[PDB]
């Protein structure tokens, strides 16, 4: 759920999840997908596609387990969906961190500035 | 949509919606989660709950008609969902204004990850 994801983003990026990625580009946020603005945006794009493939579990509300031992996200055993959900979030937190170098605050928004269509995931 | 909500909030509270509530506490803004920290956060909590009852429309993108008539938000879309959606927004806007007395800027960009679980709606 948003609790795991959010905590992961914070752990990987050190940034406030909602503040830097709640509304960022075309894919970081609660507004669906769009043509990636930049490497941070592309991370969220893939994240949303990662969710799409999921089957059965609610990526927004299903709470799952994961360890933060040695400051690396270790997805808990869980079940297939939950494990896959966790990996989706882990993956985006990491990607987000790895792309902090090009993170551009200018892509942060109040209301998504209209975005180009996003490749069918 | 966020446009109507943002204007309602500005109109009601007289403060920039995004800055003051875009990321306030545990329930305000980009999908805020968990138990409200205070009255203002509670408003957003109630708001997110109100949103759950919406059948047929999307608070994110669905625009709706409402008027500001004698400094009162007056919902206009006779379309049932949109009207209800509009009433959700109106209500949170009024609630925020009403609890401006305890608005805590230290929560303005609260670290949502710090948020505890929230009761069901």
Question: Residue B1 belongs to a domain with what CATH number?
Answer: 1.20.90.10
Across the interface, do A18 and B32 touch by the CB < 8 Å criterion?
Answer: yes
CA distance to A108, B6, B15, B26, per residue, from B18 (Å) = 11, 7, 9, 15
Select from B121, B87, B92 the least CA-distant residue to B24. Answer: B92
Decide: residue B82, CB within 10 A, 0-12 exposed, 13-18 middle, 19+ buried: buried
Structure method: X-ray
User: What number of residues does chain B have?
Assistant: 121
Residue whose structure tokens are 């969710």: A51
At A45, list the tokens: 């794009």
Distance, in Å, from the CA atom of A67 to the CA atom of A81, rounded to the nearest integer, reads 17
Cβ atoms within 10 A of the Cβ of B54, count? 16
Distance, in Å, from the CA atom of B16 to the CA atom of B70, rounded to the nearest integer, reads 21
Residue whose structure tokens are 């769009």: A34
At A40, list the tokens: 């941070």
Are the C-beta atoms of A96 and A36 separated by less than 8 Å? Answer: no
Across the interface, do A19 and B115 touch by the CB < 8 Å criterion?
Answer: no
CA distance to A55, A95, B8, B9, B98, per residue, from B12 (Å) = 42, 39, 6, 5, 9
First to last CA, chain B: 21
Question: In Å, what resolution does this model reach?
Answer: 2.2
Distance, in Å, from the CA atom of A64 to the CA atom of A5, rounded to the nearest integer, reads 10
B33 touches chain A (CB under 8 A): yes
**Tally of helices (H runs) and strands (E runs) in chain A:** 4, 4
The number of folded domains in chain A is 1
Across the interface, do B6 and A110 touch by the CB < 8 Å criterion?
Answer: yes
Domain region containing A99: 1-121
Q: Torsions phi, psi of A74, nearest 5?
A: -110, 105
Distance from CA of B55 to the nearest CA of A (A): 18
B34 touches chain A (CB under 8 A): yes
Q: Which of B22, B32, B34 sits opposite A110 (nearest CB)?
A: B22
Distance, in Å, from the CA atom of B30 to the CA atom of A14, rounded to the nearest integer, reads 18
């Amino acid at each position: 759920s948003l609790f795991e994801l959010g905590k992961m983003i914070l752990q990987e990026t050190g940034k406030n999840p909602a503040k830097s990625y709640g509304a960022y580009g075309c894919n970081c946020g609660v507004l669906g997908r769009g043509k990636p603005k930049d490497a941070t945006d592309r991370c969220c794009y893939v994240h949303k596609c990662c969710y799409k493939k999921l089957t059965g579990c609610d990526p927004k509300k299903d709470r799952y387990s994961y360890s933060w031992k040695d400051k690396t996200i270790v997805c808990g055993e869980n079940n297939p969906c939950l494990k896959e959900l966790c990996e989706c979030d882990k993956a985006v937190a990491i990607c987000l961190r790895e792309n902090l170098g090009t993170y551009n605050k200018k892509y942060r928004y109040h209301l998504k500035p209209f975005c180009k269509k996003a490749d069918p995931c």
